[PDB]
């Protein structure tokens, strides 16, 4: 009856300075800011959730307007606990600075 | 290098009372109460001895440009003690060749009107900054006694009238006129 996903912000794509590579998202996960702490989140299921105009299906429920783009959390990125991720479809750049959920359920505990 | 410790003590006489509110100092004695805020100077101020005999200022880990501030605090504090126990008296004399300088004191020490300097009609009104008193003395012809507690106010009010009586656009090596500081000293001799 509460939240079952960690909060993350789509900081950008995996990018050089004059080149960006849209196949890999960069996720800043709230609370973890160091590579010793990012190890819990490797291989987690992450998801970008958004609404739309016309209805789509929903598995185990009624058709509604919310939609997703699923993905995994591949490996860490830099010393500040920033992490990489790969999604099934590459993210639209609408999502720069929007709340990507990072689930718990591919669990290793 | 950085010197690991530099300290000096200042002996505090029996009639005067210094105390500390952090880094600022306050001094109470016979003539009045005089405070000063040292919060720009980053030292340690211990008040040691019971019957309050010594003010020990010490600075840890200083370069020489900030170890220079160690005994300048001692100089300001013992100048403060001198100004509270004994007070300060700057007797500055009027010097003129032809036209006499007419000094008239208004609002009991607080304003000085200087007239007839080099013959000109412009009256010079100089205000003493608050806490010092100017007075035309007796037993001397043309003298101005500035009495106060703190030397910054006394000597600054003296320097205001010495910068007021100035000869401009002429040869200052021939025109030796104006009021100049003559005898720095003390109201009550020890």
């Amino acid at each position: 009856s509460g939240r079952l996903w960690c909060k993350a912000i789509f900081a950008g794509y995996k990018r050089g300075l004059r080149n960006q590579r849209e196949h890999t998202a960069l996720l800043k996960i709230e609370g973890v800011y160091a590579r010793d702490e990012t190890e819990f989140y490797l291989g987690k299921r992450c998801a970008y959730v958004y609404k739309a105009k016309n209805n789509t299906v929903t598995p185990g429920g009624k058709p509604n307007k919310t939609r997703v783009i699923w993905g995994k959390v591949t490996r860490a990125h830099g010393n500040s606990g920033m992490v990489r991720a790969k999604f099934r479809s590459n993210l639209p750049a609408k999502a720069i600075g929007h709340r990507i959920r990072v689930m718990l359920y591919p669990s290793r505990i | 290098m950085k010197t690991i410790l530099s300290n000096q003590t200042v002996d505090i006489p029996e009639n005067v009372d210094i105390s500390l509110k952090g880094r600022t100092v306050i001094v109470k004695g016979p003539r009045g109460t005089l405070r000063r805020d040292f919060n720009h100077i980053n030292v340690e101020l211990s008040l040691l001895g019971k019957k309050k005999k010594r003010l020990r200022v010490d600075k840890w880990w200083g370069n020489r440009k900030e170890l220079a501030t160690v005994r300048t605090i001692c100089s300001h504090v013992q100048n403060m003690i001198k100004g509270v126990t004994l007070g300060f008296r700057y007797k500055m004399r009027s010097v003129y060749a032809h036209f006499p300088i007419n000094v008239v004191i208004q609002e009991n020490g607080s304003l000085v009107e200087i007239r007839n300097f080099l013959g000109e009609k412009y009256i010079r009104r100089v205000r003493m900054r608050p806490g010092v008193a100017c007075s035309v003395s007796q037993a001397q012809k043309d003298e101005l006694v500035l009495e106060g507690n703190d030397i910054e106010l006394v000597s600054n009010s003296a320097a205001l009238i010495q910068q007021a009586t100035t000869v401009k656009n002429k040869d200052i090596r021939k025109f030796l006129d104006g009021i100049y500081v003559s005898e720095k000293g003390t109201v009550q001799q020890a």
Partner: protein
């Protein structure tokens, strides 16, 4: 003014580094920013330590500036530091921090169910004190 002084024989809690969370006894001073140190009754081997990882505390045990680890252990266990440290308020809040870090899920639930009523009783005691202060004010 200051009250904790780096000198020969002060113990110091260590903030971080390899020996994070232990006491050491400062033996001698090498530089402006480094010191020969030894915690012999806590397994900190004789070594140098920078000053900016060690938080000097208010326990001074007396031994000379060149003394060996034998005599540092003698002075340590004669002053009996390891009980004074466990008895002081510093390590009590260190150990309380470590307890709520160690806190599991089930006892986090138990602490929630406890502190809910432990605040409810306080809150109505506070408001009955407030109405008592009002009736004494009028």
């Amino acid at each position: 003014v200051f009250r904790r002084f780096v000198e020969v024989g002060r113990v110091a809690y260590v903030s971080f580094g390899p020996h994070a969370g232990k006491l050491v006894a400062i033996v001698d001073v090498i530089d402006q920013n480094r010191a020969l140190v030894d915690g012999p009754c806590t397994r900190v081997r004789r070594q140098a330590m920078p000053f900016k990882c060690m938080q000097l505390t208010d326990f001074i045990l007396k031994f000379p500036h060149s003394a060996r680890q034998k005599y540092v252990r003698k002075a340590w266990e004669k002053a009996d530091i390891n009980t004074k440290w466990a008895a002081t308020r510093w390590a009590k809040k260190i150990e309380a921090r470590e307890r709520k870090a160690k806190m599991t899920d089930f006892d986090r639930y138990k602490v929630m169910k406890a502190k809910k009523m432990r605040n409810r009783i306080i809150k109505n005691e506070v408001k009955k004190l407030q109405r008592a202060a009002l009736l004494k004010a009028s």
